Amino acid sequence: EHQAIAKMRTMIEGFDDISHGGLPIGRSTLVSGTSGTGKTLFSIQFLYNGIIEFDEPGVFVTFEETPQDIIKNARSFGWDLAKLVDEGKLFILDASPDPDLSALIERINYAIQKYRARRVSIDSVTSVFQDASSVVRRELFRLVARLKQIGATTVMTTERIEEYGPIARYGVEEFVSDNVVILRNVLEGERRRRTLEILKLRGTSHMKGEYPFTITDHGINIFPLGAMRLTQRSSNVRVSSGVVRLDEMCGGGFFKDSIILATGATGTGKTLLVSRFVENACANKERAILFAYEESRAQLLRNAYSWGMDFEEMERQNLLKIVCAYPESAGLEDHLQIIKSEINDFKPARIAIDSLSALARGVSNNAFRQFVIGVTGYAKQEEITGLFTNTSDQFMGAHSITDSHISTITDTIILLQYVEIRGEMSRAINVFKMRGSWHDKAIREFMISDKGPDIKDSFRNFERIISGSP
Amino acid sequence: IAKMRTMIEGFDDISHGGLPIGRSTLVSGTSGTGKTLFSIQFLYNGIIEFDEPGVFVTFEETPQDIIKNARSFGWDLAKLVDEGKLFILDASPDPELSALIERINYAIQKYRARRVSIDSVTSVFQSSVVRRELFRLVARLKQIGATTVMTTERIEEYGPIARYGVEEFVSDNVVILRNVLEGERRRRTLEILKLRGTSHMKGEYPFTITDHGINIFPLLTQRSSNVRVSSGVVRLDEMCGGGFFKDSIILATGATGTGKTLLVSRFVENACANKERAILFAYEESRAQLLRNAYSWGMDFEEMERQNLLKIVCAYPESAGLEDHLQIIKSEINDFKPARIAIDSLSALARGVSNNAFRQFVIGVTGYAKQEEITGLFTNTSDQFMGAHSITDSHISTITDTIILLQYVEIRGEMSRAINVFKMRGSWHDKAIREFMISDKGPDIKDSFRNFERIISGSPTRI
Amino acid sequence: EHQAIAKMRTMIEGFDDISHGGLPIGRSTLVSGTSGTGKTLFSIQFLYNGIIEFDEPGVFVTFEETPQDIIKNARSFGWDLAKLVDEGKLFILDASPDDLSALIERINYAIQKYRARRVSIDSVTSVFQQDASSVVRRELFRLVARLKQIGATTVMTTERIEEYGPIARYGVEEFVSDNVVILRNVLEGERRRRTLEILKLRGTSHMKGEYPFTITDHGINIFPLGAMRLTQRSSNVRVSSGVVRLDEMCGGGFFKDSIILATGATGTGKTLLVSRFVENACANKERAILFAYEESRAQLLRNAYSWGMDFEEMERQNLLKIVCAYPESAGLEDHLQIIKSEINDFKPARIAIDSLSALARGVSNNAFRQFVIGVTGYAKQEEITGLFTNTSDQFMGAHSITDSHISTITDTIILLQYVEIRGEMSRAINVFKMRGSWHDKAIREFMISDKGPDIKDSFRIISGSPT
Ligand SMILES: Nc1ncnc2c1ncn2[C@@H]1O[C@H](COP(=O)(O)OP(=O)(O)OP(=O)(O)O)[C@@H](O)[C@H]1O
Ligand SMILES: Nc1ncnc2c1ncn2[C@@H]1O[C@H](COP(=O)(O)OP(=O)(O)OP(=O)(O)O)[C@@H](O)[C@H]1O
Ligand SMILES: Nc1ncnc2c1ncn2[C@@H]1O[C@H](COP(=O)(O)OP(=O)(O)OP(=O)(O)O)[C@@H](O)[C@H]1O
Ligand SMILES: Nc1ncnc2c1ncn2[C@@H]1O[C@H](COP(=O)(O)OP(=O)(O)OP(=O)(O)O)[C@@H](O)[C@H]1O
Ligand SMILES: Nc1ncnc2c1ncn2[C@@H]1O[C@H](COP(=O)(O)OP(=O)(O)OP(=O)(O)O)[C@@H](O)[C@H]1O
Ligand SMILES: Nc1ncnc2c1ncn2[C@@H]1O[C@H](COP(=O)(O)OP(=O)(O)OP(=O)(O)O)[C@@H](O)[C@H]1O
Ligand SMILES: [Mg+2]
Ligand SMILES: [Mg+2]
Ligand SMILES: [Mg+2]
Ligand SMILES: [Mg+2]
Ligand SMILES: [Mg+2]
Ligand SMILES: [Mg+2]
């Protein structure tokens, strides 16, 4: 026309959706972060993807690492650079020391037009000036300007010392570059959280703020929070809960494309509903994943066997997959990526998390919510009926279903609670709510035996039941 | 002191007329705050409104770059630059002081302009040395009689205003653009620190960068009548005594699964049939689940949308900041012109934000549906079912005109619901807790809860 | 303390009370500020007030701003420096670059040339932006000492980078001078609160801490929220509330010199009690102001009529004035300013605020209390019956009267509450107390209709769910 900026798709999982296309063409993009944020990896993926996807020859300019180390390091992510160097599709410009700007611009311009390279990656300019906050501005501006005329899209790596200090080392590089990306490795308590951020994109629009990401065997995996987004398919289909009495209490089964949440005090029978729930899928030749977060695979099996359920059988048949882990063993972003990886490989019909309350421990209520949105959102988009557990910190203290306030993110709510009746400790199941279906509104009493849960009749001749002592 | 209007949506209000004429205005901020976009909107608007010539001095960027990025919003920087209306004086050093001021005055005259935009004065000095040099620039510029905009750069978001700590004391007018990190979410605000010799609005104001450039949001002149509209529930209309006032803010509150998302359905529909337009801003449920559920209750949102008498939005509250959300609801109410508006829910947009930020949001939204005579039903889920003592956890009860209380009542091992009209500003309403049930048709309010005491607690004791 | 130091009257609203007389005579005063805090506007209002109210000739020394702009700016408030200069009463001794002993010589020349008593320099910093801590200290000393010898009460302006960092830009000026004032512009979560403080007055006493102030069309307006009075002036004169049945429970209406507070949950009748309180004023031929922060003039008059009250007419008689505002527009300091200014241009018999709770939203508990003591102490100091409203965050089980703890600053409390009676939400009014009068120590029923309140017969109704 023109009426915008043409972008260059990076092919990095999530980055194209945040930048709304990729990296502005011909312009230089600054990618600064602390040590081990994924700067070197970002610039490599930028080139590797450009060649493997579009045959856009790339140039990589290293200052510390050796060309042989750049290739051996890239080996972990399972991509062969030595094969691309030989094909004349990738060239590693070794501008490193050994046991001024003019000389470099030359070599970079020599290798660009030699390989018809459309993509370039410098890592990391900073190490070069290692002077004066003014000198770095001029020397940097010179490089950025000289690279602009060539019409080559560059990715400049910059080092940092603080997670929230100045954007770049000298507090100047940010204004020189047209596009700025910040890679963070923030420390919560003792867990590291990876966040990528597009600060500015001179010309075009983008998504603002930090976005969680992970470094896996596939490289950088970003997760656009609300991209995009609240547009998952919803069917009026029904699925069994594993309990006939609960099937009826919910208007004849659960609901394919729904999030179920069983809440209650400790030992109310949450892991039972989960056991019967996962076993039902396997009694229909359907796959199911049970994400255990508070019981060993050995205990779940022995407890399920006392309820008349053979988890080992469903496992030998490859219908049931148990994934146990410590919530504190990793970050909430890692758990999400782990879960998403499991659903893609195993491709199950039902999912269960025992429990959500355990993942919400020693974490911000905001970080936990963004997690529940990711798990529930991903499950709804794939029409994977998910059942989430939640333990009440309080026993016989009503108020709110959850202390995390995830009631509005759930579609169905099964409320389990203790009830002191005649110096005994009875239990009461209840379908608090069910979106898109009629549901039983009775506070039914249920028992637990070797034959699972026997849902009996409600307490008609009782007031103040919800109090836990009527 | 006379001020020339900028036409930057909201800035003229905060500045009370615009920018002090014949005086330099400093605009400092961090990277990607809008310092450069601010200066371009200054010359552009000043022209495409008043044909007032304008000059632009660059130090890092290239004229080709300015014109290139100048598009994005669809600004003919090409024609204007060539039409003789605008001129871009380069000044960047070759890749491989007094002359500047001389090249500038010659430019101001050679084009006959009263709007200049320097950017950036920091790129240069690369602060006792910057104090004098910056003094001379701003000084000689006051004589030329030009209203300047000098862009500066900052490192910290709440630290110094400029780089060296003088730029502010040299300039007469200071504006601060910010990009504060609101826990993973970015909130850009504009504040006028000082306007020598004139009054302005103190403090920071939230703004957003969009296709129409910048849209700053400043902040009780409304207007109401006695005209009443339906709620979709014939009875609920009887409990309110004719229904809801055309120009009013309604609030349905209760625990989860009480029937607030239902009422929102009937409310949006009472407009669909009446041949009126209704917008639904959903933040909890997906379009698909709503429609499916919308149908499981009778109403057919699929058809109501085809007749162009309804607009379902759908968005994550965590997708953007409160400011961004407000700008959507707004830019969405002006490109549809609806009679009433529904929000499901307020508790959703309150999540992961400060009570202060949320309140500033609920006011701005409400402060709109009013200055536009639009019916506004807002939903709110109480994170306390049974034994709750408050209409809202965010305390927004004294910002709404009507309130619908939905609560759970345990009547002998039975989870029963109870609707009520807690209040109704400037009307009679039924002041009794009515038991209601939900079917495949919608709500059905029955007799009250007589023969029971302490219904409020949620576990009453029959008399 | 036998003989105290003679102080120069500033005539800057509130400053003379904080300083205990004004600026010590013969000594220079440092006014450190953070850019746009009001360092210049203070140095001008200092000379101006001297020239206009004491014939005290003034000399304003500029180091950056042109004498033109200095004057051009003053017109903003309605001052005419151009005139006061043509008379040789004031002199803008320009010193803006295109030393040391030069400026001093020029100074003493003007002081004696104009017999000037007040001097103001703005600023002794941009003069150094063209040094080292060791230099400025001795440089700043040479200036002060010389002025102390001339015997001219000076006001030297200084710049600050941080709001709570060093006093001056070098950490020296704070000690060279005898008197130090700190003008702050602190960011209180998006809203700006400017406060004045006297860090030290060598040889005399003063009020310590920060004092909130505003910059308006009448210059700097400080509020010494601390010591003033509490001498007051009260009477046994009664005032009707416009309900009749309430005036009875109050022992014959409210006291003319008293603070009335109407507390209750939302939709209780706090706004209705204000209407009835206002109509009574327009009937007794008395001017009344209404500060509505929740509803707009439109919604008020419309809601007022529904209660059989012509708010539209009451104003058509220049007897009622509705001041609709937003608590989120400005800060408390800015509200207290608009409220006072409003009372001084109308001089009403009674004012009603709807509501205190709306103004206590997003502000600290101490900043609010300060504001309440402000409007309360002011409404009382002018013998004006003030009625304040306060919404309760919770209903049925309210532990206390107010969540902000404002009850002990009120004299009369009108407690409103919801009462559940057999699946029916009923209302109950009560006079919780009355400073120096008998009141109906009983919670009575209460209904609202086309008219207004109708206090029915009396009746644990406190829990909101009686038995
Ligand atoms: N196969 C892999 N699986 C998971 N993580 C990996 C894998 N390979 C590398 N990593 C992680 O990626 C990081 C390497 O990122 P990269 O070298 O790009 O960081 P950087 O920001 O450039 O660091 P520096 O500035 O110190 O050079 C390591 O910290 C390592 O934990
Ligand atoms: N074979 C059995 N016979 C009878 N009751 C049993 C049997 N097995 C388990 N239970 C009961 O079930 C309870 C445990 O059920 P479950 O593990 O589902 O509880 P939960 O809600 O998941 O608790 P937690 O959150 O502590 O893990 C025990 O407290 C016990 O009362
Ligand atoms: N068409 C568009 N729609 C929405 N947002 C846009 C559009 N074009 C640009 N933007 C955003 O507006 C911002 C304006 O950047 P601007 O050049 O004003 O920053 P700056 O403060 O000058 O930065 P620096 O200090 O580094 O020069 C960009 O960062 C970009 O994110
Ligand atoms: N007529 C007016 N009415 C209301 N407010 C005004 C008026 N004129 C100026 N102001 C306000 O008062 C301020 C004036 O303060 P002043 O110019 O004294 O700042 P300062 O502390 O001297 O700043 P600097 O250190 O940069 O010189 C302006 O920022 C403006 O907000
Ligand atoms: N077809 C139906 N028949 C009977 N009951 C139904 C039917 N559809 C829905 N319901 C009931 O009505 C409720 C609908 O909840 P709704 O979404 O209206 O309320 P909400 O408080 O807004 O919910 P949430 O907190 O999830 O946003 C469910 O709890 C369910 O029990
Ligand atoms: N014309 C009328 N006829 C009967 N009852 C009415 C009428 N107008 C209002 N009401 C009742 O009185 C209430 C109005 O009282 P008022 O406006 O003083 O409440 P409030 O305590 O100020 O509440 P808020 O602080 O939420 O505005 C309404 O909620 C309604 O119940
Ligand atoms: Mg690296
Ligand atoms: Mg368990
Ligand atoms: Mg710029
Ligand atoms: Mg809902
Ligand atoms: Mg000044
Ligand atoms: Mg009211």
Asked if B363 and C326 come within 8 Å (Cβ–Cβ), the reply is yes
Contacts of B269 (CB under 8 A, 6+ apart): B232, B278, B299, B304
B183 is in an annotated binding site: no
Mutate to test the pocket of ligand 2, among A246, A263, A271, A299 (most ligand atoms within 8 A of CB): A271
Q: Which residues pair with B119 in a beta bridge?
A: B58, B151
Whether C49 contacts chain B with CB within 8 A: no
Closest partner CB to B287 (pick from A205, A230, A467): A230
Q: Specify which residues B175 forms β-bridges with.
A: B27, B192
Q: Do chains A and C touch (3 or more CB pairs under 8 A)?
A: no
Ligand nearest to the CA of A391: 2
Residues of chain A with CATH 3.40.50.300: 7-222, 244-469
Instruction: Please tell me the residue having the least CA distance from ligand 5 atom 5.
Output: A438
Looking at chain C, the number of H-run helices and the number of E-run strands are: 14, 22
Q: Identify the CATH assignment for C238-460 out of 3.50.50.60, 3.10.20.70, 3.40.50.300, 3.40.605.10.
A: 3.40.50.300
Structure tokens at B364: 């701005």
Own/partner contacts of B447-454, CB < 8 Å, gap of 24 or more, are B448/C422, B448/C423, B448/C424, B449/B409, B449/B418, B449/C422, B449/C423, B450/C422, B450/C423, B450/C424, B451/C422, B452/B411, B452/C422, B452/C423, B453/C420, B453/C422, B453/C465, B453/C466, B453/C467, B454/C420, B454/C465
Annotated binding residue A217: yes
Q: What angle do CA A119, A122, A126 make, to 5 degrees?
A: 155
Q: Quick check: CB of B253 below 6 Å from ligand 5?
A: no
Q: Which ligand is closest in space to the CA of residue B174?
A: 4
Token pair of C15 as six digits: 């400053």
Q: Is the CB of A434 under 6 A from ligand 5?
A: yes
* Alpha carbon nearest to ligand 6 atom 7, residue: B427
**How many angstroms is it from C449 CA to the middle of ligand 6?**
10
Structure tokens at B49: 């409104």
Q: What are the tokens at A227?
A: 């991209």
Rounded Cα distance, B92 and C60, in Å: 41
The answer, for A145 touching chain B at a CB cutoff of 8 Å, is yes
Shortest CA gap B23–chain C (Å)? 10
- Burial label for A30, CB within 10 Å (0-12, 13-18, 19+), is buried
DSSP state of C165: S
| Active-site annotation holds for A294 | yes
Dihedral of the CA atoms C235, C238, C239, C245 (nearest 10)?
A: 150
Give, in order, the Cα–Cα distances in Å from A141 to each of A109, B94, B123.
16, 10, 10
Q: Which residues of C are annotated as a binding site for Mg(2+)?
A: 40, 271, 294
Question: CA of C304: which chain B residue's CA is closest?
Answer: B426
- For residue B372, what are its two tokens? 């536009």
Residue C418 β-bridge partners: C427
Q: Name, in order, each residue with C-beta under 8 angstroms of A184's C-beta and a sequence gap of 6 or more.
A: A33, A34, A37, A163, A193, A194, A195, A196, A197, A210
User: Residue A91: which of A46, A59, A51 has the closest Cα?
Assistant: A59
Token output for C373:
């003591």
How far is it, in rounded angstroms, from Cα B34 to Cα B209? 8
Q: Sort B447 into a burial class: Cβ within 10 Å, 0-12 / 13-18 / 19+.
A: exposed
Could you give the CA distance from residue A431 to residue A262 in angstroms, rounded to a whole number?
A: 9
Query: Ligand 7 center to residue A158 CA distance, Å?
Result: 9
- Give the Å distances, CA to CA, from B361 to B188, B206, B280, B350, C130: 15, 10, 17, 9, 47
Q: Which amino acid is at B349?
A: L
Q: What is the distance in angstroms between the CA of the first residue and the CA of the last residue of chain B?
A: 74
The boundaries of every CATH 3.40.50.300 domain in chain B are 3-216, 228-463
Grouping H, G, I as helix, E, B as strand and the rest as coil, residue B300 is coil
Which atom belonging to ligand 5 lies closest to the Cα atom of B293? 8
Q: Do chains B and A touch (3 or more CB pairs under 8 A)?
A: yes
**Phi and psi for B283 in degrees, rounded to 5?**
-130, 0
B151 marked as binding residue: no
Positions at the binding site of C for ATP: 36-41, 76, 200-202, 204, 206, 216-217, 266-272, 307, 427, 433-435, 437, 439, 441
Q: Is the peptide bond before A124 cis (omega within 30 degrees of 0)?
A: yes
User: A244-469: which CATH topology?
Assistant: Rossmann fold (3.40.50)
How is residue A452 annotated by DSSP?
Answer: E
The answer to whether the beta carbons of residues A187 and A331 sit under 8 Å apart is no
Q: Please answer whether residues B46 and B54 qualify as being in contact, where contact means their C-beta atoms are separated by less than 8 angstroms.
A: yes
- Ligand that comes closest to the CA of residue A430: 5
Contact C299 B425 (CB under 8 A): yes
Conformational region of residue C42, where left means phi above 0, alpha means psi within -120 to 50, and beta covers everything else:
alpha
Residues 6+ apart with CB under 8 A from B278: B267, B268, B269, B271, B272, B309, B310, B311, B338, B339, B340, B341, B342
- Check CB contact under 8 Å for B432 and C449: no
Q: Is the peptide bond before C439 cis (omega within 30 degrees of 0)?
A: no
- Are B196 and C73 a contacting pair, CB within 8 Å? yes
Look at chain C and count its residues. 467
C275 and C452 in contact (C-beta within 8 Å)? yes
**Which residues in chain B are contacts of A238 at CB distance < 8 A?**
none
Nearest-angstrom CA–CA distance, C406 and C357:
10
Place domain B3-216 in its CATH homologous superfamily.
P-loop containing nucleotide triphosphate hydrolases (3.40.50.300)
Alpha helix positions (H), C294-407: 297-305, 311-316, 332-346, 356-359, 365-381
Discontinuities in chain B (C→N > 2.5 Å), after residue: 96, 126, 219
Query: What type of residue sits at position A65?
Result: E
In Å, how far are A260, A451, C266 from A309, measured between CA atoms? 21, 9, 55
Residue A297: name the closest of A325, A327, A265, A262 by CA. Answer: A325
Using a CB-CB cut-off of 8 Å, the residues of chain C touching B365 are none
Alpha helices in A263-355 (DSSP H): 270-282, 297-305, 311-316, 332-346
Is the separation of the CB atoms in B118 and B148 below 8 Å?
A: yes
Closest listed residue to residue B319, CA positions, set B331, B308, B327: B327
Separation in Å, CA C96 to CA B425, C32, C38, C61, C142: 61, 20, 20, 9, 20
Residue of B nearest to A399 (CA): B384
Handedness of CA B179, B180, B181, B182 (dihedral sign): negative
Where in chain C do CATH 3.40.50.300 domains reside?
A: 7-222, 238-460
Show the tokens assigned to B241: 């005594």
- The identity of residue B36, as a single letter, is T
- Is some CB atom of chain C closer than 8 A to the CB atom of B203? yes
Beta strand C385-391 with C412-420 is unpaired
Q: Which of C97, C357, C465 sits opposite B135 (nearest CB)?
A: C97
CB pair distance less than 8 Å for B398 and C192: no
**Strand (E) or helix (H) holding A365:** helix A365-381
Residues 6+ apart with CB under 8 A from C105: none
Whether omega for the bond prior to residue B223 falls within 30 degrees of 0, making it cis, is no
Distance B75 CA to ligand 9 centre (A): 17
The fourth-level CATH superfamily of domain B228-463 is: P-loop containing nucleotide triphosphate hydrolases (3.40.50.300)
C75 interfaces chain B, CB cutoff of 8 Å: yes
What does the alpha-carbon distance between residue A176 and residue A199 come to, in Å, rounded to a whole number?
Answer: 13
Instruction: Give the torsion sign (CA, B438, B443, B444, B449).
Output: positive
Rounded CA separation A28/A179 (Å): 7
DSSP string, B210-230: ETTEE-----------S-EE-
Ligand 2 atom, smallest distance to A416 CA: 21
- Chain C: partners with 3+ C-beta pairs within 8 Å: B
Token digits of residue A67: 């060309």
Find out whether C319 and C286 touch, Cβ atoms under 8 Å: yes
Amino acid identity at A133: S
Q: Which residue's alpha carbon is at the smallest distance from atom 13 of ligand 6?
A: C267
- Rg (alpha carbons) of chain B, rounded to whole number: 28
Q: Cβ C426–B431 below 8 Å, yes or no?
A: yes
How far apart CA A75 and CA C343 sit, in angstroms, is 79
3-state secondary structure of A335: helix
Q: What are residue C128's DSSP bridge partners?
A: none
Residue C197 φ then ψ, to 5°: -145, 140
| Dihedral (CA of A124, A129, A130, A133) sign | negative
How many Å apart are CA C405 and CA A379, to the nearest integer?
Answer: 49
Nearest of A182, A180, A219 to residue A45 by alpha carbon: A219
Vertex C382: Cα angle to C381 and C388 (nearest 5): 85
The span from the CA of B391 to the CA of B400, in Å, is: 11
Look up tokens 């990793």; give the residue.
A330
- Identity of residue C163: E
Q: Does B109 touch chain A (CB under 8 A)?
A: no
Give the separation between CA A34 and CA B377, rounded to whole angstroms: 47
Beta strands (DSSP E) in B182-277 are 186-195, 204-206, 209-210, 213-214, 228-229, 244-245, 249-254
Q: Does any CB of chain B come closer than 8 Å to the CB of residue C135? A: no
Instruction: State the structure-solving technique.
Output: X-ray
Ligand nearest the Cα of residue A267 is 2
Q: What separation in Å is there between the alpha carbon of A153 and the centre of ligand 9?
A: 20
Q: The tokens of A225 are what?
A: 């929070």
Omega of the bond prior to A127 within 30 degrees of 0, cis? no
- B interface mutation test: which of C363, C424, C426 has the most B CBs within 10 A? C424
Write the CA distances from B280 to A344, B229, B343, integer angstroms.
34, 17, 6
DSSP C73-125: HHTTTT--HHHHHHTTSEEEEE-----THHHHHHHHHHHHHHT--EEEEE-TT
Both tokens assigned to C407 = 């009850």
Element (H, E) at A387: strand A385-391
Rounded Cα distance between A322 and A304, Å, is 13
User: Apex CA C253: angle with CA C249 and CA C256, to 5°?
Assistant: 145
C317 lies within 8 A of chain B by CB? no
Which CATH number fits the domain C7-222, given the four candidates 3.30.1360.200, 3.40.50.300, 3.40.47.10, 3.30.1300.30?
Answer: 3.40.50.300
What's the gap in Å between the CA of B211 and the closest CA on chain C?
26
Atom 27 of ligand 3, residue of closest alpha carbon: A175
Return the residue in B39, B318, B408, B451 with the most chain A beta carbons within 10 A, the one to mutate for interface testing.
Answer: B318
Give the residue ranges of DSSP H helices in B3-127: 11-15, 35-50, 63-70, 77-83, 98-111, 121-124
- Inspect the interface and report whether the beta carbons of A401 and B289 lie closer than 8 Å: no
**Which residue from B31, B68, B282 is facing A199, i.e. has the nearest CB?**
B31
Pocket of ligand 3 (CB under 6 A): A 174-175, 200-206; B 29, 31-37, 72-73, 153, 209-211
What is the C-alpha to C-alpha distance for residues B156 and A167, in angstroms, rounded to an integer? 9
Q: Which helix (H) or strand (E) holds A449?
A: strand A444-449
Tokens (6 digits) for A79: 């991509």
Q: Which of B285, B397, B279 is nearest to B330 (CA)?
A: B279
CB C294 within 8 A of CB C358: yes
CB C368 within 8 A of CB C334: no
How many Å lie between the centroid of ligand 7 and the Cα of residue A83? 22
